[PDB]
PDB file of C-alpha atoms in Angstrom:
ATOM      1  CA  UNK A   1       0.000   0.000   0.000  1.00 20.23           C
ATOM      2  CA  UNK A   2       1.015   3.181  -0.461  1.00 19.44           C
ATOM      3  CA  UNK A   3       0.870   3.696   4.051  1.00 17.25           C
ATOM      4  CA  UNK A   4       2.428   0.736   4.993  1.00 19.38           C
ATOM      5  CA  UNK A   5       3.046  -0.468   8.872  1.00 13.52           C
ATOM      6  CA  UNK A   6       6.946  -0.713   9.577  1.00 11.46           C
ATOM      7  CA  UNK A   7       7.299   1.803   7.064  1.00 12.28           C
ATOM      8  CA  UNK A   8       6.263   5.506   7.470  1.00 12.19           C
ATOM      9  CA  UNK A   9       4.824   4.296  10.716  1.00 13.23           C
ATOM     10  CA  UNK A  10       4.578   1.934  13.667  1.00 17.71           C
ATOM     11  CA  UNK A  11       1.994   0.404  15.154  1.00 15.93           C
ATOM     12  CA  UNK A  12       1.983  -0.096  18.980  1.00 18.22           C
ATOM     13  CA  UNK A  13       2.250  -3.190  20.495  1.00 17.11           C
ATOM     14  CA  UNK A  14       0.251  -1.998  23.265  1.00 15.11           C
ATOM     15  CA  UNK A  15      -1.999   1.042  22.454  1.00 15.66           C
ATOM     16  CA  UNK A  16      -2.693   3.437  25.133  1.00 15.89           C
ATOM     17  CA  UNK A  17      -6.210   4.226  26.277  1.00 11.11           C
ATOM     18  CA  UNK A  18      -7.538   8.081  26.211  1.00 11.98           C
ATOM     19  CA  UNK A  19      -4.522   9.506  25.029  1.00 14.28           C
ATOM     20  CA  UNK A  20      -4.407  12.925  23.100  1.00 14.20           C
ATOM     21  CA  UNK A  21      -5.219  12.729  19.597  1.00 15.22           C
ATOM     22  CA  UNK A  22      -1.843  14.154  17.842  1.00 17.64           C
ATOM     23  CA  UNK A  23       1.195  13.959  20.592  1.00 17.28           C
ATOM     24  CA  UNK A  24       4.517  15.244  20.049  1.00 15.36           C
ATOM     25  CA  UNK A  25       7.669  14.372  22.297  1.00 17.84           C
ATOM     26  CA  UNK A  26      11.108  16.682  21.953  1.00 21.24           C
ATOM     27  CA  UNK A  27      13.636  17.656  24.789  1.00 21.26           C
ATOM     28  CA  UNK A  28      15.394  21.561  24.104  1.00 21.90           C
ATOM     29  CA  UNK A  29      18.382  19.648  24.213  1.00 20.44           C
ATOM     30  CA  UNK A  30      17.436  16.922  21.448  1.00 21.78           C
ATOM     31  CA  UNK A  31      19.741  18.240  18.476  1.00 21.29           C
ATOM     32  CA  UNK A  32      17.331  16.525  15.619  1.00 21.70           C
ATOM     33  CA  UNK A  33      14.525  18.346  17.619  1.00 21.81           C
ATOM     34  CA  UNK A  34      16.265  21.726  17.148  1.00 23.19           C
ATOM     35  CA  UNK A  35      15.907  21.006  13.507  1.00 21.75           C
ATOM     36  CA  UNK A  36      12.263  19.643  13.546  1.00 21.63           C
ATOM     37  CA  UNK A  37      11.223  22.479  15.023  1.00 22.06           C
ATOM     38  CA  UNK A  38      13.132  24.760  14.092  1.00 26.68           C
ATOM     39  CA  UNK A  39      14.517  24.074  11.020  1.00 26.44           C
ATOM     40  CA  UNK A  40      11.590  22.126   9.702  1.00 26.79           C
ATOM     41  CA  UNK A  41       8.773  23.300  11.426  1.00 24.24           C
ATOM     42  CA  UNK A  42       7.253  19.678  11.767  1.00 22.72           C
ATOM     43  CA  UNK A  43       4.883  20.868  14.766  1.00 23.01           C
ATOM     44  CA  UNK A  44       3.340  23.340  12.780  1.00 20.39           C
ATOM     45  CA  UNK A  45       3.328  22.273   9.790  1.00 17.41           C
ATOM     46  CA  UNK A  46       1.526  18.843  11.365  1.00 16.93           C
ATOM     47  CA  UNK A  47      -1.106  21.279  12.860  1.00 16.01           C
ATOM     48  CA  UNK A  48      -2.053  22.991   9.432  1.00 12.87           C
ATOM     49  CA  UNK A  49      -3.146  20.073   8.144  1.00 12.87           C
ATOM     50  CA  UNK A  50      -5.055  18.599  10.531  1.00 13.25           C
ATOM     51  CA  UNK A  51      -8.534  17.462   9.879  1.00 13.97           C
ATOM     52  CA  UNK A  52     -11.032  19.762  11.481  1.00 14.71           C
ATOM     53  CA  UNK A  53     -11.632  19.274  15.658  1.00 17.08           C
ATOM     54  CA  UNK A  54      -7.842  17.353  16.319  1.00 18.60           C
ATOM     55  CA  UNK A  55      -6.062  19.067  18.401  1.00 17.60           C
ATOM     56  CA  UNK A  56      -2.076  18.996  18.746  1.00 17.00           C
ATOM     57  CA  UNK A  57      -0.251  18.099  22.002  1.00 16.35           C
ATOM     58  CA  UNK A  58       3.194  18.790  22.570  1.00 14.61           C
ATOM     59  CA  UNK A  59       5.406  17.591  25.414  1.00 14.88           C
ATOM     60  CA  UNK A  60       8.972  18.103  26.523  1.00 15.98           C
ATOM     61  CA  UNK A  61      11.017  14.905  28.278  1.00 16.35           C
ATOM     62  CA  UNK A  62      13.280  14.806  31.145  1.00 13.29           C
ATOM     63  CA  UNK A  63      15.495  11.877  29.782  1.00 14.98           C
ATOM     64  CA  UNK A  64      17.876  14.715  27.959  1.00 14.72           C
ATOM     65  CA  UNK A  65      20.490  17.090  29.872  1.00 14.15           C
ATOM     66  CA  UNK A  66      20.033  16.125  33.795  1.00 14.82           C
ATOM     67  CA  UNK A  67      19.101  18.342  35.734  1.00 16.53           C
ATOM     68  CA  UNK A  68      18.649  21.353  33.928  1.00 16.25           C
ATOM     69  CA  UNK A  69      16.459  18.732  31.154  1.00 15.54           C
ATOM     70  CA  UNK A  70      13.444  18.544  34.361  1.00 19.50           C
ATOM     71  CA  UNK A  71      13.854  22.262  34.995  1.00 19.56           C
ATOM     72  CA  UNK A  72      13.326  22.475  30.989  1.00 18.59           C
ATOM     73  CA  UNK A  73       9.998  20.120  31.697  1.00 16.88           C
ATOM     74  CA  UNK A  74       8.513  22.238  34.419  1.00 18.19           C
ATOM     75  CA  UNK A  75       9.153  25.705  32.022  1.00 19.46           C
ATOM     76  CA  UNK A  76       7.731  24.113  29.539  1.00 19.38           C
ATOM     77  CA  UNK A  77       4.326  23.245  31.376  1.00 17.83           C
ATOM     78  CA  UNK A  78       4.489  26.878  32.593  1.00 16.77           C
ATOM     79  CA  UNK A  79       4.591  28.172  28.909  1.00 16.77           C
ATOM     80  CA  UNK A  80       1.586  25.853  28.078  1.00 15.07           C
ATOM     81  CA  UNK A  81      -0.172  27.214  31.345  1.00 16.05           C
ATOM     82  CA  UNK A  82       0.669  30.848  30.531  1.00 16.45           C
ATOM     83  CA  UNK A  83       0.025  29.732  27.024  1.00 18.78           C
ATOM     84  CA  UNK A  84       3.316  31.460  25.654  1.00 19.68           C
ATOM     85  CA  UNK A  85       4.900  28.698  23.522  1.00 21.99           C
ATOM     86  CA  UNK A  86       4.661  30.898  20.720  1.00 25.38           C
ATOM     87  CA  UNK A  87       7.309  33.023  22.408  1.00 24.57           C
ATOM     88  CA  UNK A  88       9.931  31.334  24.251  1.00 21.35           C
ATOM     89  CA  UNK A  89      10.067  27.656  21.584  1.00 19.90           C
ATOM     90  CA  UNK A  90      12.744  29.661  19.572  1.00 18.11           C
ATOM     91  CA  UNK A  91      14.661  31.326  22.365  1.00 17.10           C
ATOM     92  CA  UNK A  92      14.509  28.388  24.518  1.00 18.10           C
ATOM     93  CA  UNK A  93      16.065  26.352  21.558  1.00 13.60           C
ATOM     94  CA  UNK A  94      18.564  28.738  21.379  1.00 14.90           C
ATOM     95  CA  UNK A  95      19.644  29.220  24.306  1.00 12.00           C
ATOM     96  CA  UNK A  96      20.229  25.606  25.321  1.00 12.96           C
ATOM     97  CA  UNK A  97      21.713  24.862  21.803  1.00 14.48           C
ATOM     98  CA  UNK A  98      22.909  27.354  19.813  1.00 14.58           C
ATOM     99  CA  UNK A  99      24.140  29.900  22.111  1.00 15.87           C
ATOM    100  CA  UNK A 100      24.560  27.806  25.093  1.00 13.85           C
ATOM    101  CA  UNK A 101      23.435  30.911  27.507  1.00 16.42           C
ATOM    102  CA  UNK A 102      20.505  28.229  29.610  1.00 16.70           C
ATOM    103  CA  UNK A 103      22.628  27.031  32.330  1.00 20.57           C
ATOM    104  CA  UNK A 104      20.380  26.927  35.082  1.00 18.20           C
ATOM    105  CA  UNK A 105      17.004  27.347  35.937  1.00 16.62           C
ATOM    106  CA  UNK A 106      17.601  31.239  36.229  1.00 16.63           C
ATOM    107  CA  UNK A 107      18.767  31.191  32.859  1.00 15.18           C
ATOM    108  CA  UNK A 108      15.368  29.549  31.698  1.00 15.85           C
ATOM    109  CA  UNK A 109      13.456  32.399  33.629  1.00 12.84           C
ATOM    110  CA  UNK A 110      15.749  35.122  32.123  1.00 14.12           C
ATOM    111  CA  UNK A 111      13.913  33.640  28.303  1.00 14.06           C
ATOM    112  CA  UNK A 112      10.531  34.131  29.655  1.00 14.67           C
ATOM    113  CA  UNK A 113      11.225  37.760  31.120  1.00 16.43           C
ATOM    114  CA  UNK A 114      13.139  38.919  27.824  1.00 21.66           C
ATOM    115  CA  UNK A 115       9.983  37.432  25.816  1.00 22.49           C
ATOM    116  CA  UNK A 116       7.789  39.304  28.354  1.00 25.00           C
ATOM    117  CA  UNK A 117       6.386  37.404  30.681  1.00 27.09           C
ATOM    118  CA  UNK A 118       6.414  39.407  34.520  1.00 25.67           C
ATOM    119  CA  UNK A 119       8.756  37.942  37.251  1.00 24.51           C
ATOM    120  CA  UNK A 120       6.005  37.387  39.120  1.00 22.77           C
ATOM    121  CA  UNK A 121       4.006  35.707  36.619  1.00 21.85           C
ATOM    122  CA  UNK A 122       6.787  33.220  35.938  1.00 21.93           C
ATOM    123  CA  UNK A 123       7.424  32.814  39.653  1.00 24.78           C
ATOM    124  CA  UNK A 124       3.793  32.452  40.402  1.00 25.64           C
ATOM    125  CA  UNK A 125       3.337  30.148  37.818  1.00 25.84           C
ATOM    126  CA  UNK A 126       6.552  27.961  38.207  1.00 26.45           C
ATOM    127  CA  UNK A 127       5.254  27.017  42.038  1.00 25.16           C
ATOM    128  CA  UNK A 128       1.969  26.546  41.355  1.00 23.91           C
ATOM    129  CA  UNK A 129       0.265  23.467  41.552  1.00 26.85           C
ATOM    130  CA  UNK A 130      -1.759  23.850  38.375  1.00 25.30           C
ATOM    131  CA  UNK A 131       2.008  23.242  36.635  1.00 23.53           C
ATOM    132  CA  UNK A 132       2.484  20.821  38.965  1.00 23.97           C
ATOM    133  CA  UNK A 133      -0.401  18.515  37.111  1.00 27.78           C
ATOM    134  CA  UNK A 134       1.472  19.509  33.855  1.00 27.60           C
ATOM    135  CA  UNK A 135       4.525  18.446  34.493  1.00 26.67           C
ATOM    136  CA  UNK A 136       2.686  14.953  35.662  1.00 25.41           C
ATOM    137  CA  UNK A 137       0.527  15.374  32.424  1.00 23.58           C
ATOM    138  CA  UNK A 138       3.918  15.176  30.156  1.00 21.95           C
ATOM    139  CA  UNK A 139       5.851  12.614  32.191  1.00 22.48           C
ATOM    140  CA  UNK A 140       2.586  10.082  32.365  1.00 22.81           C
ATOM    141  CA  UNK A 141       2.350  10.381  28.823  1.00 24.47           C
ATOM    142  CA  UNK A 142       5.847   9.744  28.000  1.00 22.36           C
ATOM    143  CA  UNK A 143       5.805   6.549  30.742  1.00 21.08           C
ATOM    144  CA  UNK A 144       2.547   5.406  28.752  1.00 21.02           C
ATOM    145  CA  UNK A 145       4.566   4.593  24.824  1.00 18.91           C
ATOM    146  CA  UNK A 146       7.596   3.798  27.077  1.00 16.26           C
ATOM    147  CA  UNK A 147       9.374   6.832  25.500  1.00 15.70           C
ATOM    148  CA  UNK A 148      13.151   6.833  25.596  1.00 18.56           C
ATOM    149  CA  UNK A 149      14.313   8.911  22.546  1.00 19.39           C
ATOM    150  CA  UNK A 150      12.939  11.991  21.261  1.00 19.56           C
ATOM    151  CA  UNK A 151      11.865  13.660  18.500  1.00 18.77           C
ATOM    152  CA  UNK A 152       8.920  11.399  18.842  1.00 18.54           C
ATOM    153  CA  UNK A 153       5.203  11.926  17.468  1.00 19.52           C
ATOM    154  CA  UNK A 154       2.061   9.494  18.221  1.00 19.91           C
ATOM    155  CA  UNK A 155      -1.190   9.346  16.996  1.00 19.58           C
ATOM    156  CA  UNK A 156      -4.060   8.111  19.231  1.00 20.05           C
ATOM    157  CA  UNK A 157      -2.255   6.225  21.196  1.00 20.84           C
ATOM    158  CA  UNK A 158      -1.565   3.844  18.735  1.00 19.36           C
ATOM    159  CA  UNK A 159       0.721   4.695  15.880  1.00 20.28           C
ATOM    160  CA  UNK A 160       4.202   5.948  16.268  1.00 19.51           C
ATOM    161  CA  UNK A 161       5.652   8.029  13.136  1.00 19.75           C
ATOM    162  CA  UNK A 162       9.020   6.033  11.482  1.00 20.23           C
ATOM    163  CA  UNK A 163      10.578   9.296   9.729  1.00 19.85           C
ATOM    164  CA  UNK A 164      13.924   7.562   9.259  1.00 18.13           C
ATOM    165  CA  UNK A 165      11.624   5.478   6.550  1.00 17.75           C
ATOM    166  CA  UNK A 166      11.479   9.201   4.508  1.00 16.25           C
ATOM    167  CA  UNK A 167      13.747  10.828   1.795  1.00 15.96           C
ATOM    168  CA  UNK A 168      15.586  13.463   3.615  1.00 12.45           C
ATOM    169  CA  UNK A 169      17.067  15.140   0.341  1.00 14.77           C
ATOM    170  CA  UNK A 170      14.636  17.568   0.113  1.00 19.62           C
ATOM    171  CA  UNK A 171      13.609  19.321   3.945  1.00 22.09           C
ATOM    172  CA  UNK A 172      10.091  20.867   1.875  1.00 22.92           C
ATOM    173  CA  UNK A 173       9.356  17.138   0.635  1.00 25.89           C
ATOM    174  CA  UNK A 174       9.845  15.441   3.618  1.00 22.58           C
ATOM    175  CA  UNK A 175       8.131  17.799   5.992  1.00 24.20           C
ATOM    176  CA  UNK A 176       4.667  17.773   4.003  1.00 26.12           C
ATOM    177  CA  UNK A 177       5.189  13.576   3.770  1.00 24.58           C
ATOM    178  CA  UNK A 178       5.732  13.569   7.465  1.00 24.44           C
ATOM    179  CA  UNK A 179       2.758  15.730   7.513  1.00 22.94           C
ATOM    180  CA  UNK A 180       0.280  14.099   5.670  1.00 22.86           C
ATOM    181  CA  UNK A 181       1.224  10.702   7.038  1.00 23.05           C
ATOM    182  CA  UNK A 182      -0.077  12.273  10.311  1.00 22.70           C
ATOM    183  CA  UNK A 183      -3.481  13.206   8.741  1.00 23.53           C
ATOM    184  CA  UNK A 184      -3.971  10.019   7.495  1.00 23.65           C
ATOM    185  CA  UNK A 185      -3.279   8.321  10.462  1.00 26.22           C
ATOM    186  CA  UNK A 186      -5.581  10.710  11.968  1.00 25.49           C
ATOM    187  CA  UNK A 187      -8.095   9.698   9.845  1.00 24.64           C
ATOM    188  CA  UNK A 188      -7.549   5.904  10.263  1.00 24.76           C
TER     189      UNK A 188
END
């Protein structure tokens, strides 16, 4: 067939009940996720096509960089409770991998401040409990499709994307075929 199990995609050997539709794994340390996202631009060019009323989930993982790779996890659930992903993705990248200026959690907070979120927004947000259940949100999902490298995308809870099963010459070509491999799953 022209979607073919083992090739552009995986099926799981043990699907996961009442997980989010369209779920995508990456650590700000994950060098291939620097280019997915930003490079690429898997996540939203993923979105863009998706049929009408599936939504997009994206997670970070704490398996990458130690320490500062959990701080990374709990600024990342504040960014999707302050809803600023759309500011501090690129910087965040950055930071960690391109101008290696994120050293420590203050260096994570120092992103969010320059992108303009208040100190005590960030602060507030960072101990609340409400990011608490996010940062539980992202690691029960990864511990669900026994995650262990990242970039990583899932579909219902049952289909894992196989990218390496893709022509990389062209980063346009294989973007939109990662793309639309996601629809169809979606519409499986």
């Amino acid at each position: 067939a022209q979607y073919e199990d083992g090739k552009q995609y995986t099926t799981l050997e043990k699907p996961v009940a009442g997980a989010p539709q369209v779920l995508e794994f990456f650590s700000f340390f994950c060098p291939h996720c620097y280019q997915f996202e930003e490079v690429l631009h898997i996540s939203d060019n993923v979105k863009k096509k998706l049929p009408e009323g599936v939504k997009m989930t994206k997670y970070h993982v704490n398996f990458m960089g130690g320490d500062l790779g959990k701080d990374l996890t709990q600024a990342w659930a504040v960014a999707m409770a302050l809803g600023v992903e759309d500011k501090v993705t690129v910087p965040l990248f950055e930071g960690v991998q391109k101008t290696q200026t994120i050293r420590s959690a203050s260096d994570i907070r120092d992103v969010f401040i320059n992108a303009g979120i208040k100190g005590e927004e960030y602060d507030a947000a960072w101990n609340s409990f409400v990011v608490k259940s996010l940062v539980a949100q992202q690691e029960k999902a990864a511990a669900d499709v026994q995650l262990r490298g990242v970039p990583a995308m899932f579909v219902n809870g049952k289909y894992q994307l196989n990218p390496q099963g893709m022509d990389t010459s062209n980063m346009d070509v294989f973007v939109q075929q990662y793309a639309d491999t996601v629809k169809y799953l979606s519409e499986k």
